[PDB]
Amino acid sequence: TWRVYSTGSNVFQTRAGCLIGAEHVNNSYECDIPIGAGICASYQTSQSIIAYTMSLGAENSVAYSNNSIAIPTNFTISVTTEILP
Amino acid sequence: VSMTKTSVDCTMYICGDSTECSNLLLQYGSFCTQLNRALTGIAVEQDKNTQEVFAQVKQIYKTPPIKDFGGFNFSQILPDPSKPSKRSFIEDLLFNKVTKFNGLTVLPPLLTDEMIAQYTSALLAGTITSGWTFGAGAALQIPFAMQMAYRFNGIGVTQNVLYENQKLIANQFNSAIGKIQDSLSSTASALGKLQNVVNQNAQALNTLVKQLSSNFGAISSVLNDILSRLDPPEAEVQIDRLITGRLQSLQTYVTQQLIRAAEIRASANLAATKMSECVLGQSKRVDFCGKGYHLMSFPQSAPHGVVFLHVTY
Amino acid sequence: IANQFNSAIGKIQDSLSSTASALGKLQNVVNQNAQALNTLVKQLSSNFGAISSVLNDILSRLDPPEAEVQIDRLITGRLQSLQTYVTQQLIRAAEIRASANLAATKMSECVLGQSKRVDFCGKGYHLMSFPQSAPHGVVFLHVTYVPAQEKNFTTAPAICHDGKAHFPREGVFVSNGTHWFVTQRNFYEPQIITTDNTFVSGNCDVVIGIVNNTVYDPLQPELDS
């Protein structure tokens, strides 16, 4: 019955269908609401719903040589949790 | 690892564009609330099996531009930057061997195959440049000639065997990697485990369409043929024989797919254990990361699964 | 170490009191069993093609030659509701069986001993574990060992002293720019290269990347007796 979203300037054609009601951004963050085919959605910045590509993590290339080594000097003691029914 | 996500509709499958059929379906209670809740939880679980296997680390590591690994050639498993699809030579051979309107929909997966190949290339750059340190803290730079001096000590071999025979081990490693490229280009029956997942999901959907042409004791199978011949005190009886005959066809498809989802769940928990014990370290368990004394492993991508390359002694 | 362990237990009390979705694996079992029993009750009010859903209504308005047809539509519709509820509960009982066998394996390996399996009893090098009780489940507390600060050095596979190659027994060779020392792989402790930390085998011709240094002999102050 409802046809109030077909005004325009909000379509974003994806591989699962066009997302009517969210604008497209060029950034890439760790998404929480999965949509499909790499596209995600979130409610962040006057707030709106954004749509972007899901990022896979930070970029960190390590150094590498034929005569280089890395030896640790300190340590932290960490206590984690795990829940199993 | 995973299966094919799907979803069925109750309105268009049982009632072929008929408002008289939908009035009789409301008297059967909430049968289709349970049928849509069951197939939704399967498609959510198929996206969770790819998260526990591939997303073991979250920092993306890169290969240095100069190749100096003590004589070892990793040009068959590293991705090709010239191709638009970031895949290796072995991943291009694995992706070439594995090969409507009644409410049947195929939902696309969340993680794209390009994004899966970046998870595999990030772990290949971790076991080479760091080895076992990037899975238990921060990445520490260790040379590749010094990594096998520790891995030989874990199986009871001293460091004099590796350093005095560096040319013999490097020649046997490059000849064994290239032998899989000559094997996967000839025989196609090695990927029979991944082909049975697609064939079982195709026969389960072809049977669901062919059961719409059955009469189930009625006059005809078309719902438009009964409404245009019979009076509605009599047409309700022939329609009710088709609703019960088609409701049992849908409950068999959901029940048979809930056991296949539990079989593919046990194979995803086994693959997630081998990505942490055989790839991120050296395992002492016999016949877990290959036959013999395990040294290291390399993960590879595959359609609806994983492919391991264990290196033994 | 004792100050870092006592501060880690206090962070769990602040995390469990503030966050309300820390036990989502245990509340999903209770919510799934609640929706399965609510569906079995609400399907008693359906007709399944009969006159009424109440069995006391069709038994009083019609004859037993006539009421046998309306009762048959209510029995067959309600028998498929019990066959569906048992079948879905028999699959969920198999999923909770695999979670119970996994918790019994971690009770013996992570708690009753020390496991060398990577990413099984926590992230990092596992030291010990402590179990805790929970409604319809268990809660583990994995104590691990994570290195923090790093430093770059210069390494070498072996050293040649007087025509013989010297390989280390434990650890790797490092260098601060001028001298050479022997340290472990997980912690930095510089030691003097003596004959008790080396392993003589062969010459320094076939080792690729060897350097030249001296190995101290502890029998040199012995001659001053």
Numbering used by the authors:
A (entry chain B): 632 to 676, 689 to 728
B (entry chain C): 729 to 827, 854 to 1067
C (entry chain B): 923 to 1147
What does the paper say about this structure?
The spike (S) protein of SARS-CoV-2 is a glycoprotein that forms trimers protruding from the virion surface and mediates viral entry into cells. The S trimer uses its receptor-binding domain (RBD) to bind with the host-cell receptor ACE2, followed by a substantial structural rearrangement to fuse the viral membrane with the host-cell membrane. The Delta variant harbors multiple mutations in S protein, including two substitutions (L452R and T478K) in the RBD, the D614G substitution, a cluster of mutations in the N-terminal domain (NTD), and two more substitutions near the furin cleavage site and in the heptad repeat 1 (HR1). Here we present cryo-EM structures revealing two conformational states of Delta spike and S/ACE2 complex in four states.
